[model samples]
Target: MFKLLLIFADPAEAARTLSLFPFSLNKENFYTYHTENVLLDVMVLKTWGYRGVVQALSPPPSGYDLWINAGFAGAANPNIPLLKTYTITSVKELTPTTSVEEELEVTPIPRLPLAQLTSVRSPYRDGFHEHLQLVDMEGFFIAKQASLVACPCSMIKVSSNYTTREGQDFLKNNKVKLSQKLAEAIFPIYSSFID
Candidate 1:
């Protein structure tokens, strides 16, 4: 049996993608859905911003085969194809306060691009950051928290929009389709981890 710690940034995001799993979700308590081979423990947080990722993971739940932070992100590179899932390799720190200047890295999975991503507290109107291919609000902290406990982790992000306005429209229009793409991309990793 294998248990997986799934870190999600929003409920819509979770619902949109998690449908690909083989278990049934009771609309009331969707997070409890699981199969004999996979037990998914999800964390949903956003009010506290990007730091919420760390807060949710700091305590570090026990007995998980893998720790995964799967969600949506904006592309720093306009060339990045929309709705395609990409595995993040490194994350830049953009937390508001602290002298901490460390970059978080993920244990790269085979067959996934080892790309760089940026972590934000959600105020990224200007949009682009150097050396980063995608931008999201949670990956960095989740990877950081996993590192502290030496847990093997992965950050999978899907490109949904290129600009703020486009992103807004995508959220309003394509969440389900794009999230489904993401779910399909990462599904194989689930079996790889447990096996």
Candidate 2:
């Protein structure tokens, strides 16, 4: 069986997805360590306190084929409904002179549209409104890690909130539900990786 890694940004997202597929849930030894080929880290981005997650797989893992970054993202397009899954086509870092981009391979499942992955410090902050399509802290880092190990990586994000002040509240309140939705959407694809 092919080993697949799912990296989640927070507990809510992890809890949501793990609840559906308990068999895939493997507890990590440390906060940012690997467990059963799955790594879950809580990554939050900011200016003074930029606590981000970074993984450097030197030798890489044996039998591991696919690496997936799954979580919730703030939507720039207001029409995208909450709890809907999206397959990210490309990931771009918001930082200047950071030429990092990872192209995805899998065909998005039916009904899930393609979205541009964005690495923004804060989607709620001003001046970031026009550039980002979807905002999250960990997708780019996870993609970078996979690239280091020469593994193919892809992202699956669910729209938990819109680009508004209320979106923050929605993220806090419905984190469990949002996480579950992400897990449900991801498992079918995860299953495909298995022999």
Candidate 3:
């Protein structure tokens, strides 16, 4: 049977995601759901950035068939549709200087709309980068650790904002509904591999 790991950056978001699945809260840090053909372990990091990724995966959850990091992102490209989920095609850490960092390509999920994500250190509100489409706090770090452990990884980012005050307000009001949509986006991919 295939085993899958799903990571979320926020507890509220994670709670919403898990509500859509037939899952049981196994513990504070871990939760699980299973079928005869597949098993899923879900985590809510409650922390932010690379440190959060490290804190949660420290001892590491080993022997998974796939790892998925899903969360909200501020759109670097304001024109991108809001609350729409896209499979991340690549991940890169946003650095302070103009120096470019190595970009990591994700394990692809076929037939899904794709986006490239940049992992930022904090909430960002600045001029857009010509190439970056989305910005989140943990995707690159999570993908980095997954690559080291030889786990195939993927990320799904829903546009929560355009890095504007107005966008943030919109996200605040819609977090629950947006999390539901995030759960819906995740289901088909999980089923595709499980079956």
- In order, the Cα lDDT scores of the candidates are 0.71, 0.63, 0.81
- Which candidate number would show the highest lDDT if scored against the true structure? 3
Candidate 3's TM-score reads 0.89
Candidate 1, residue 83: Cα displacement in angstroms equals 1.1
Report the lDDT tens digits of candidate 2 across residue range 1-195. Answer: 355666666556776555454343227332332345353332222222345434333343434566677888887766567777888887766654475544434334545689887766555433235656777766766676677677787788888777777567877798877777877877677555443
Off by over 4 Å in 2: 23-50, 55-63, 96-111, 127-131
Local accuracy of candidate 3 as per-residue lDDT tens digits, 1-195 = 999999998875776778877788675647899987889889877645544546666665679989988889888786788888888989988786775676899976666689888887777777556777988988888888887778999887888878865667877888887788778888888788756
> What's the ranking of the predictions by lDDT, best on top?
3, 1, 2
Worst 10 residues of 3 by lDDT: 47-56
Candidate 3 segments whose C-alpha is farther than 4 A from its true place: 47-53, 97-100
For each candidate, C-alpha RMSD in Å? 3.6, 5.4, 2.4
Better of 1 and 2 by lDDT: 1
Q: Ten consecutive residues with minimal summed lDDT in candidate 1?
A: 47-56
Clashes, model 3:
0
Clashing pairs in 2: 16-179, 16-180
